[PDB]
PDB file of C-alpha atoms in Angstrom:
ATOM      1  CA  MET A   1     -25.013  -7.051 -19.933  1.00 27.61           C
ATOM      2  CA  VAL A   2     -24.459  -4.750 -22.983  1.00 25.11           C
ATOM      3  CA  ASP A   3     -22.049  -5.204 -25.928  1.00 25.05           C
ATOM      4  CA  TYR A   4     -19.861  -2.222 -26.950  1.00 18.29           C
ATOM      5  CA  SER A   5     -17.360  -4.563 -28.701  1.00 19.03           C
ATOM      6  CA  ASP A   6     -17.856  -2.628 -32.004  1.00 18.30           C
ATOM      7  CA  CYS A   7     -16.309   0.562 -30.479  1.00 17.78           C
ATOM      8  CA  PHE A   8     -13.249  -1.407 -29.191  1.00 21.08           C
ATOM      9  CA  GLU A   9     -12.307  -2.575 -32.755  1.00 20.17           C
ATOM     10  CA  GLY A  10     -10.805  -5.926 -31.558  1.00 21.11           C
ATOM     11  CA  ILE A  11      -8.941  -4.220 -28.638  1.00 17.96           C
ATOM     12  CA  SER A  12      -9.360  -6.228 -25.392  1.00 18.51           C
ATOM     13  CA  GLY A  13     -11.309  -4.271 -22.763  1.00 15.32           C
ATOM     14  CA  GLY A  14     -14.568  -3.404 -21.032  1.00 19.46           C
ATOM     15  CA  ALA A  15     -16.810  -0.472 -20.098  1.00 22.71           C
ATOM     16  CA  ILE A  16     -19.225   0.366 -17.244  1.00 21.75           C
ATOM     17  CA  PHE A  17     -21.760   3.265 -17.150  1.00 23.71           C
ATOM     18  CA  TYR A  18     -23.796   4.079 -14.003  1.00 25.38           C
ATOM     19  CA  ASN A  19     -26.994   6.206 -13.794  1.00 22.04           C
ATOM     20  CA  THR A  20     -27.561   7.445 -10.180  1.00 19.55           C
ATOM     21  CA  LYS A  21     -31.269   8.051 -11.093  1.00 17.83           C
ATOM     22  CA  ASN A  22     -32.370   4.396 -11.683  1.00 20.72           C
ATOM     23  CA  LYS A  23     -29.235   2.987  -9.894  1.00 22.02           C
ATOM     24  CA  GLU A  24     -28.637   0.857 -13.051  1.00 24.59           C
ATOM     25  CA  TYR A  25     -25.226  -0.216 -14.449  1.00 26.18           C
ATOM     26  CA  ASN A  26     -24.607  -0.762 -18.201  1.00 21.25           C
ATOM     27  CA  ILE A  27     -21.775  -3.368 -18.180  1.00 19.61           C
ATOM     28  CA  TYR A  28     -19.641  -4.539 -21.149  1.00 18.76           C
ATOM     29  CA  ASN A  29     -17.299  -7.413 -20.000  1.00 17.17           C
ATOM     30  CA  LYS A  30     -18.362  -7.972 -16.342  1.00 22.84           C
ATOM     31  CA  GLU A  31     -15.217  -9.981 -15.395  1.00 24.73           C
ATOM     32  CA  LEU A  32     -12.869  -7.188 -16.588  1.00 24.45           C
ATOM     33  CA  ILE A  33     -14.843  -4.268 -15.027  1.00 20.86           C
ATOM     34  CA  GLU A  34     -14.651  -6.121 -11.631  1.00 19.00           C
ATOM     35  CA  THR A  35     -10.839  -6.674 -11.905  1.00 17.39           C
ATOM     36  CA  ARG A  36      -8.634  -4.310  -9.833  1.00 16.10           C
ATOM     37  CA  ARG A  37      -5.694  -2.714 -11.735  1.00 19.81           C
ATOM     38  CA  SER A  38      -3.348   0.249 -11.166  1.00 19.32           C
ATOM     39  CA  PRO A  39      -5.373   3.450 -11.825  1.00 20.30           C
ATOM     40  CA  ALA A  40      -2.290   5.111 -13.409  1.00 20.25           C
ATOM     41  CA  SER A  41      -2.989   8.866 -14.052  1.00 17.55           C
ATOM     42  CA  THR A  42      -6.796   8.476 -13.434  1.00 15.09           C
ATOM     43  CA  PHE A  43      -5.636   8.803  -9.786  1.00 16.29           C
ATOM     44  CA  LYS A  44      -5.200  12.519 -10.517  1.00 13.72           C
ATOM     45  CA  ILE A  45      -8.973  12.797 -10.118  1.00 15.99           C
ATOM     46  CA  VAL A  46      -8.498  11.978  -6.381  1.00 15.63           C
ATOM     47  CA  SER A  47      -4.985  13.475  -5.855  1.00 16.68           C
ATOM     48  CA  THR A  48      -6.437  16.827  -7.119  1.00 11.38           C
ATOM     49  CA  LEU A  49      -9.121  16.768  -4.339  1.00 12.10           C
ATOM     50  CA  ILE A  50      -6.495  15.668  -1.731  1.00 12.62           C
ATOM     51  CA  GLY A  51      -4.250  18.638  -2.674  1.00 12.97           C
ATOM     52  CA  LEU A  52      -7.189  21.116  -2.515  1.00 14.03           C
ATOM     53  CA  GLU A  53      -8.509  19.699   0.826  1.00 14.27           C
ATOM     54  CA  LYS A  54      -4.967  19.946   2.369  1.00 17.10           C
ATOM     55  CA  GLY A  55      -4.208  23.474   0.991  1.00 15.36           C
ATOM     56  CA  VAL A  56      -1.213  22.268  -1.129  1.00 14.58           C
ATOM     57  CA  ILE A  57      -3.116  23.772  -4.146  1.00 13.57           C
ATOM     58  CA  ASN A  58      -6.056  26.243  -4.064  1.00 12.17           C
ATOM     59  CA  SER A  59      -7.237  26.885  -7.662  1.00 11.42           C
ATOM     60  CA  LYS A  60      -6.982  25.897 -11.354  1.00  9.16           C
ATOM     61  CA  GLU A  61      -3.997  28.369 -11.566  1.00  6.49           C
ATOM     62  CA  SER A  62      -2.057  26.846  -8.577  1.00  9.62           C
ATOM     63  CA  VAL A  63       1.618  26.060  -9.429  1.00  7.28           C
ATOM     64  CA  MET A  64       3.991  23.696  -7.542  1.00  7.58           C
ATOM     65  CA  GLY A  65       7.340  25.228  -8.659  1.00  7.19           C
ATOM     66  CA  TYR A  66       9.414  23.902 -11.611  1.00  8.93           C
ATOM     67  CA  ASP A  67      13.085  22.970 -10.846  1.00  6.18           C
ATOM     68  CA  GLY A  68      14.095  23.147 -14.554  1.00  4.67           C
ATOM     69  CA  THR A  69      14.306  19.331 -15.001  1.00  7.87           C
ATOM     70  CA  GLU A  70      14.100  18.634 -18.775  1.00  3.02           C
ATOM     71  CA  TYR A  71      11.469  15.863 -19.248  1.00  4.12           C
ATOM     72  CA  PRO A  72      10.877  13.673 -22.332  1.00  2.00           C
ATOM     73  CA  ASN A  73       7.335  15.157 -22.456  1.00  2.00           C
ATOM     74  CA  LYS A  74       8.216  18.799 -23.354  1.00  2.00           C
ATOM     75  CA  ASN A  75       4.668  19.827 -22.206  1.00  2.00           C
ATOM     76  CA  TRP A  76       6.006  19.206 -18.617  1.00  2.00           C
ATOM     77  CA  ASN A  77       9.025  21.564 -18.980  1.00  2.00           C
ATOM     78  CA  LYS A  78       7.519  24.665 -17.286  1.00  2.00           C
ATOM     79  CA  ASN A  79       5.888  25.859 -14.036  1.00  2.79           C
ATOM     80  CA  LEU A  80       2.459  24.624 -15.248  1.00  3.77           C
ATOM     81  CA  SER A  81      -0.885  25.324 -13.489  1.00  2.00           C
ATOM     82  CA  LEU A  82      -3.225  22.713 -11.953  1.00  2.00           C
ATOM     83  CA  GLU A  83      -5.422  22.749 -15.115  1.00  2.00           C
ATOM     84  CA  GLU A  84      -2.372  22.236 -17.412  1.00  2.00           C
ATOM     85  CA  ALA A  85      -0.824  19.528 -15.149  1.00  2.00           C
ATOM     86  CA  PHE A  86      -4.136  17.576 -15.139  1.00  2.00           C
ATOM     87  CA  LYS A  87      -4.655  17.857 -18.957  1.00  2.00           C
ATOM     88  CA  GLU A  88      -0.954  16.964 -19.648  1.00  2.00           C
ATOM     89  CA  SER A  89      -0.956  14.122 -17.020  1.00  2.00           C
ATOM     90  CA  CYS A  90       2.084  15.853 -15.390  1.00  2.00           C
ATOM     91  CA  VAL A  91       3.522  13.282 -12.920  1.00  2.00           C
ATOM     92  CA  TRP A  92       6.224  15.578 -11.415  1.00  2.00           C
ATOM     93  CA  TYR A  93       3.527  18.157 -10.400  1.00  2.00           C
ATOM     94  CA  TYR A  94       1.262  15.529  -8.716  1.00  2.00           C
ATOM     95  CA  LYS A  95       4.225  13.719  -7.062  1.00  2.00           C
ATOM     96  CA  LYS A  96       5.407  17.056  -5.545  1.00  2.00           C
ATOM     97  CA  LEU A  97       1.747  17.666  -4.461  1.00  2.00           C
ATOM     98  CA  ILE A  98       1.293  14.253  -2.743  1.00  2.00           C
ATOM     99  CA  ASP A  99       4.789  14.512  -1.127  1.00  2.00           C
ATOM    100  CA  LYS A 100       3.318  17.491   0.844  1.00  3.54           C
ATOM    101  CA  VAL A 101       0.562  15.262   2.404  1.00  2.00           C
ATOM    102  CA  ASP A 102       1.389  12.695   5.124  1.00  3.18           C
ATOM    103  CA  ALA A 103       0.532   9.040   4.339  1.00  2.00           C
ATOM    104  CA  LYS A 104      -1.981   8.964   7.253  1.00  4.76           C
ATOM    105  CA  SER A 105      -4.054  11.753   5.572  1.00  3.11           C
ATOM    106  CA  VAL A 106      -3.950   9.978   2.168  1.00  3.09           C
ATOM    107  CA  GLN A 107      -4.814   6.586   3.798  1.00  2.00           C
ATOM    108  CA  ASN A 108      -7.841   7.979   5.744  1.00  2.87           C
ATOM    109  CA  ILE A 109      -9.159   9.727   2.576  1.00  2.00           C
ATOM    110  CA  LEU A 110      -8.793   6.606   0.355  1.00  2.00           C
ATOM    111  CA  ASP A 111     -10.351   4.340   3.061  1.00  3.03           C
ATOM    112  CA  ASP A 112     -13.310   6.790   3.406  1.00  3.61           C
ATOM    113  CA  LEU A 113     -13.703   6.841  -0.452  1.00  2.00           C
ATOM    114  CA  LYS A 114     -13.361   2.995  -0.547  1.00  2.00           C
ATOM    115  CA  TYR A 115     -10.717   3.569  -3.298  1.00  2.00           C
ATOM    116  CA  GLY A 116     -10.063  -0.097  -4.260  1.00  4.53           C
ATOM    117  CA  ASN A 117      -7.366  -1.775  -2.117  1.00  6.84           C
ATOM    118  CA  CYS A 118      -6.375   1.675  -0.636  1.00  8.28           C
ATOM    119  CA  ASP A 119      -2.760   0.328  -0.683  1.00  7.28           C
ATOM    120  CA  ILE A 120      -0.198   3.214  -0.661  1.00  4.83           C
ATOM    121  CA  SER A 121       2.553   1.004   0.934  1.00  4.50           C
ATOM    122  CA  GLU A 122       4.850   1.478  -2.128  1.00  7.93           C
ATOM    123  CA  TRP A 123       4.761   5.311  -1.752  1.00  8.25           C
ATOM    124  CA  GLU A 124       7.665   5.988  -4.198  1.00  5.84           C
ATOM    125  CA  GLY A 125       6.244   3.494  -6.755  1.00  6.03           C
ATOM    126  CA  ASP A 126       8.068   0.815  -8.794  1.00  9.73           C
ATOM    127  CA  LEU A 127      11.662   2.220  -8.958  1.00 10.21           C
ATOM    128  CA  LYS A 128      12.973  -0.890 -10.842  1.00 10.29           C
ATOM    129  CA  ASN A 129      11.565   0.768 -14.045  1.00  3.73           C
ATOM    130  CA  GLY A 130      14.550   3.224 -13.840  1.00  3.57           C
ATOM    131  CA  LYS A 131      12.260   6.333 -14.016  1.00  5.84           C
ATOM    132  CA  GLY A 132      13.415   7.469 -10.508  1.00  3.91           C
ATOM    133  CA  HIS A 133      11.103  10.231  -9.119  1.00  2.00           C
ATOM    134  CA  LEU A 134       8.640   9.753 -12.086  1.00  2.00           C
ATOM    135  CA  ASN A 135       6.963   6.984 -10.048  1.00  2.00           C
ATOM    136  CA  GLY A 136       4.357   6.635  -7.288  1.00  2.38           C
ATOM    137  CA  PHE A 137       2.013   4.179  -5.535  1.00  6.70           C
ATOM    138  CA  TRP A 138      -0.643   4.974  -8.202  1.00  5.35           C
ATOM    139  CA  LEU A 139       1.575   4.129 -11.266  1.00  2.06           C
ATOM    140  CA  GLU A 140       1.754   0.302 -11.816  1.00  2.00           C
ATOM    141  CA  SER A 141       2.474  -0.103  -8.077  1.00  2.00           C
ATOM    142  CA  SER A 142       0.643  -0.997  -4.820  1.00  2.00           C
ATOM    143  CA  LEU A 143      -2.655   0.916  -5.375  1.00  2.00           C
ATOM    144  CA  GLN A 144      -5.288  -1.035  -7.388  1.00  2.00           C
ATOM    145  CA  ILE A 145      -8.974  -0.304  -8.203  1.00  2.00           C
ATOM    146  CA  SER A 146     -11.562  -1.913 -10.547  1.00  2.00           C
ATOM    147  CA  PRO A 147     -13.429   0.060 -13.267  1.00  2.00           C
ATOM    148  CA  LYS A 148     -16.671  -0.526 -11.262  1.00  2.00           C
ATOM    149  CA  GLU A 149     -14.964   0.900  -8.118  1.00  2.00           C
ATOM    150  CA  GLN A 150     -13.821   3.921 -10.224  1.00  2.00           C
ATOM    151  CA  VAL A 151     -17.462   4.610 -11.240  1.00  2.00           C
ATOM    152  CA  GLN A 152     -18.682   4.142  -7.595  1.00  2.00           C
ATOM    153  CA  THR A 153     -15.937   6.618  -6.508  1.00  2.00           C
ATOM    154  CA  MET A 154     -16.888   9.177  -9.271  1.00  2.00           C
ATOM    155  CA  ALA A 155     -20.592   8.905  -8.250  1.00  2.00           C
ATOM    156  CA  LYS A 156     -19.900   9.571  -4.514  1.00  2.00           C
ATOM    157  CA  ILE A 157     -17.580  12.543  -5.322  1.00  2.00           C
ATOM    158  CA  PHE A 158     -19.844  14.357  -7.848  1.00  2.00           C
ATOM    159  CA  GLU A 159     -23.188  13.476  -6.110  1.00  2.00           C
ATOM    160  CA  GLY A 160     -21.805  15.116  -2.888  1.00  2.00           C
ATOM    161  CA  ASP A 161     -21.545  11.921  -0.743  1.00  2.00           C
ATOM    162  CA  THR A 162     -17.853  12.540   0.289  1.00  2.00           C
ATOM    163  CA  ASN A 163     -16.066  14.877   2.796  1.00  2.00           C
ATOM    164  CA  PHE A 164     -14.544  17.009  -0.039  1.00  2.00           C
ATOM    165  CA  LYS A 165     -15.788  20.641  -0.278  1.00  2.00           C
ATOM    166  CA  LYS A 166     -18.205  21.404  -3.177  1.00  2.00           C
ATOM    167  CA  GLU A 167     -15.828  24.308  -4.105  1.00  2.00           C
ATOM    168  CA  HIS A 168     -12.938  21.818  -4.694  1.00  2.00           C
ATOM    169  CA  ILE A 169     -15.200  19.345  -6.578  1.00  2.00           C
ATOM    170  CA  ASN A 170     -16.275  22.255  -8.876  1.00  2.00           C
ATOM    171  CA  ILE A 171     -12.560  22.997  -9.611  1.00  2.00           C
ATOM    172  CA  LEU A 172     -12.036  19.286 -10.491  1.00  2.00           C
ATOM    173  CA  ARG A 173     -15.176  19.205 -12.721  1.00  2.00           C
ATOM    174  CA  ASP A 174     -13.841  22.255 -14.661  1.00  2.00           C
ATOM    175  CA  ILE A 175     -10.324  20.791 -15.354  1.00  2.00           C
ATOM    176  CA  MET A 176     -11.938  17.399 -16.364  1.00  2.00           C
ATOM    177  CA  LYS A 177     -14.207  18.917 -19.085  1.00  2.00           C
ATOM    178  CA  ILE A 178     -13.325  17.660 -22.635  1.00  2.00           C
ATOM    179  CA  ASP A 179     -14.530  19.003 -26.041  1.00  2.00           C
ATOM    180  CA  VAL A 180     -16.464  16.267 -27.964  1.00  2.00           C
ATOM    181  CA  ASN A 181     -17.878  18.579 -30.741  1.00  2.00           C
ATOM    182  CA  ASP A 182     -21.460  18.200 -29.357  1.00  2.00           C
ATOM    183  CA  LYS A 183     -22.845  21.075 -27.196  1.00  2.00           C
ATOM    184  CA  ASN A 184     -25.963  18.924 -26.429  1.00  2.00           C
ATOM    185  CA  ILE A 185     -23.804  16.756 -24.057  1.00  2.00           C
ATOM    186  CA  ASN A 186     -21.138  17.521 -21.400  1.00  2.00           C
ATOM    187  CA  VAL A 187     -18.248  14.959 -21.149  1.00  2.00           C
ATOM    188  CA  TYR A 188     -15.608  15.012 -18.356  1.00  2.00           C
ATOM    189  CA  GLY A 189     -12.771  12.570 -17.722  1.00  2.00           C
ATOM    190  CA  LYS A 190      -9.143  11.640 -17.153  1.00  2.00           C
ATOM    191  CA  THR A 191      -6.882   9.323 -19.173  1.00  2.00           C
ATOM    192  CA  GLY A 192      -4.514   6.741 -17.671  1.00  2.00           C
ATOM    193  CA  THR A 193      -1.610   4.866 -19.303  1.00  2.00           C
ATOM    194  CA  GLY A 194       0.455   2.113 -17.693  1.00  2.00           C
ATOM    195  CA  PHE A 195       2.007  -1.225 -18.654  1.00  2.00           C
ATOM    196  CA  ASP A 196       1.692  -4.187 -16.218  1.00  2.00           C
ATOM    197  CA  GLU A 197       5.202  -5.727 -16.680  1.00  2.00           C
ATOM    198  CA  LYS A 198       4.313  -8.825 -14.573  1.00  2.00           C
ATOM    199  CA  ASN A 199       1.246  -9.778 -16.730  1.00  2.00           C
ATOM    200  CA  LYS A 200       2.504  -8.075 -19.984  1.00  2.00           C
ATOM    201  CA  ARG A 201      -0.793  -6.158 -20.517  1.00  2.00           C
ATOM    202  CA  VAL A 202      -1.647  -2.435 -20.748  1.00  2.00           C
ATOM    203  CA  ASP A 203      -3.658  -0.520 -18.131  1.00  2.00           C
ATOM    204  CA  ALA A 204      -5.288   1.997 -20.496  1.00  2.00           C
ATOM    205  CA  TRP A 205      -8.098   4.068 -18.948  1.00  2.00           C
ATOM    206  CA  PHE A 206     -10.624   6.824 -19.512  1.00  2.00           C
ATOM    207  CA  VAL A 207     -12.729   7.556 -16.386  1.00  2.00           C
ATOM    208  CA  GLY A 208     -15.270  10.340 -15.947  1.00  2.00           C
ATOM    209  CA  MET A 209     -18.929  11.219 -16.477  1.00  2.00           C
ATOM    210  CA  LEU A 210     -21.502  12.333 -19.106  1.00  2.00           C
ATOM    211  CA  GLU A 211     -24.348  14.894 -18.628  1.00  2.00           C
ATOM    212  CA  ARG A 212     -27.155  14.764 -21.226  1.00  2.00           C
ATOM    213  CA  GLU A 213     -30.723  16.199 -20.937  1.00  2.00           C
ATOM    214  CA  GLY A 214     -31.181  15.937 -17.129  1.00  2.00           C
ATOM    215  CA  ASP A 215     -29.399  12.506 -16.992  1.00  2.00           C
ATOM    216  CA  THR A 216     -25.892  11.831 -15.564  1.00  2.00           C
ATOM    217  CA  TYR A 217     -23.750   8.705 -16.253  1.00  2.00           C
ATOM    218  CA  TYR A 218     -20.485   7.915 -14.399  1.00  2.00           C
ATOM    219  CA  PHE A 219     -18.196   5.736 -16.538  1.00  2.00           C
ATOM    220  CA  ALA A 220     -14.912   3.817 -16.709  1.00  2.14           C
ATOM    221  CA  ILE A 221     -13.514   2.487 -20.024  1.00  2.64           C
ATOM    222  CA  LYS A 222     -10.584   0.056 -19.599  1.00  3.85           C
ATOM    223  CA  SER A 223      -8.266  -1.897 -21.930  1.00  3.52           C
ATOM    224  CA  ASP A 224      -6.011  -4.839 -20.866  1.00  3.13           C
ATOM    225  CA  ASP A 225      -4.720  -5.375 -24.464  1.00  2.00           C
ATOM    226  CA  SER A 226      -1.292  -7.016 -25.148  1.00  2.91           C
ATOM    227  CA  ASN A 227      -0.375  -4.147 -27.589  1.00  4.04           C
ATOM    228  CA  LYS A 228       1.572  -1.277 -25.877  1.00  2.71           C
ATOM    229  CA  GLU A 229       0.163   1.057 -28.613  1.00  3.83           C
ATOM    230  CA  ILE A 230      -3.124   0.924 -26.581  1.00  5.39           C
ATOM    231  CA  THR A 231      -2.866   3.973 -24.260  1.00  3.14           C
ATOM    232  CA  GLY A 232      -5.304   6.180 -22.280  1.00  6.95           C
ATOM    233  CA  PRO A 233      -5.716   8.501 -25.324  1.00  7.44           C
ATOM    234  CA  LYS A 234      -6.775   5.463 -27.457  1.00  5.72           C
ATOM    235  CA  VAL A 235      -9.260   4.339 -24.754  1.00  4.33           C
ATOM    236  CA  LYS A 236     -10.530   7.984 -24.650  1.00  4.36           C
ATOM    237  CA  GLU A 237     -11.279   7.673 -28.428  1.00  7.57           C
ATOM    238  CA  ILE A 238     -13.214   4.397 -27.742  1.00  6.86           C
ATOM    239  CA  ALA A 239     -15.121   6.103 -24.849  1.00  8.92           C
ATOM    240  CA  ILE A 240     -16.219   9.038 -27.077  1.00 11.92           C
ATOM    241  CA  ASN A 241     -17.331   6.523 -29.778  1.00 11.52           C
ATOM    242  CA  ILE A 242     -19.370   4.557 -27.148  1.00 13.40           C
ATOM    243  CA  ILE A 243     -20.938   7.863 -25.947  1.00 12.67           C
ATOM    244  CA  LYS A 244     -21.790   8.966 -29.539  1.00 12.45           C
ATOM    245  CA  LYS A 245     -23.411   5.612 -30.481  1.00 13.85           C
ATOM    246  CA  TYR A 246     -25.109   4.539 -27.189  1.00 12.04           C
ATOM    247  CA  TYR A 247     -25.598   7.715 -25.020  1.00 11.21           C
ATOM    248  CA  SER A 248     -26.621  10.448 -27.568  1.00 12.07           C
ATOM    249  CA  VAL A 249     -30.419   9.967 -26.962  1.00 12.27           C
TER     250      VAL A 249
END
């Protein structure tokens, strides 16, 4: 096991990196990286591929149609493209996308990906949070997946071991790219922010992969901190700091 506790700065969490070359895992906090939790918006990595496979979307410019609803997040108040919806974690766009796919198609795809518990039984999500249609099975609801399962899922998608078309995977790779101010490495990923009301802990995520000098690492950074200030964006900062200190050479 490895120790990346310095990059977490006292925040409760864990990290797992996987190299498909030597089939080796670098694990910080084994018990946490094996614990299933709601994926929150990291599910957009998979819902993007589902939409492309089913023809609901077709490109990084694809739009779903904006009904004018004024959302708290003003970055959601427009007919945004796939790329924008992914980068802004736009829930209304992805809920409208998944509502165009029958549950049987989603179930078969998650079962074939071995996506954690593959439980989409609470389709509409946890409505007792009063957010109405801004809910879904992937947002603090029935679907749960461990950080290790996220990395195993990322590896199968990007190494070409799934049924998804390489054309759709290339679209996903493009919208996942993030700027880390280091052209020697390529970082891709998706943030996730949720609060587990039952256990009173955050589900803060950053899931993706790193490409550096012929080597590829699939990773999942996760926080279960008590402090609601700990969000996906904060875990993304921790991930970049882990990458800079332990994966630069």
